[PDB]
A and B are shown apart, each in its own frame.
With several copies, the nearest count.
Chain A
Amino acid sequence: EVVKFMDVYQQSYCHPIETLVDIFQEYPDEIEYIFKPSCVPLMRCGGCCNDEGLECVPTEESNITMQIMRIKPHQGEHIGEMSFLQHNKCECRPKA
């Protein structure tokens, strides 16, 4: 039940993959709040290139809106919409 080399290479090559990104990375300005969930499933550029000199970088970007629970202590809590950046296309470019 070994995973075939070409399937391994195709699954690992620089492409957008579901990444769990912390919300504090995307909205650091929102300090007073605690979020639920604290992180979000976003399509983010991941994987390797044919050579070590190259890095997997985003080319096409877009936004997705998501219901997220805002909690400010001594205030209460509500669910608002929040827009998050996602990577649609990826490229292997030299390290600058």
Chain B
Amino acid sequence: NCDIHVLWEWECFXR
């Protein structure tokens, strides 16, 4: 769900 075109969730900033 962590698409570069979309804003925010911490569990993106996991990777």
A–B touching in complex (CB under 8 Å): yes
Q: Are the C-beta atoms of B4 and A51 separated by less than 8 Å?
A: yes
Cα distance A49–B10 in the bound complex, in angstroms: 16
B10's nearest neighbour on chain A, judged by CB, is A6
Report how many A-B pairs have Cβ atoms within 8 Å: 21
B4: chain A residues within 8 A (beta carbon) = 49-51, 54, 92
Majority DSSP secondary structure for residues of B touching A: loop
Cα distance A9–B10 in the bound complex, in angstroms: 11
Q: Given A36-B13, A69-B13: A13 and B5 within 8 A (CB)? A: no
B6: chain A residues within 8 A (beta carbon) = 92
Tell me which of A9, A91, A93 contacts B8 (CB under 8 A).
Answer: A9
A91: chain B residues within 8 A (beta carbon) = 5
Give the top 9 A-B pairs by smallest Cβ distance, nearest first.
A50-B4, A51-B4, A13-B7, A92-B5, A54-B4, A54-B5, A91-B5, A69-B13, A6-B10
Interface residues, chain B, CB within 8 Å of chain A?
4-8, 10, 12-13
Interface residues, chain A, CB within 8 Å of chain B?
6, 9-10, 13-14, 36, 49-51, 54, 69, 91-93
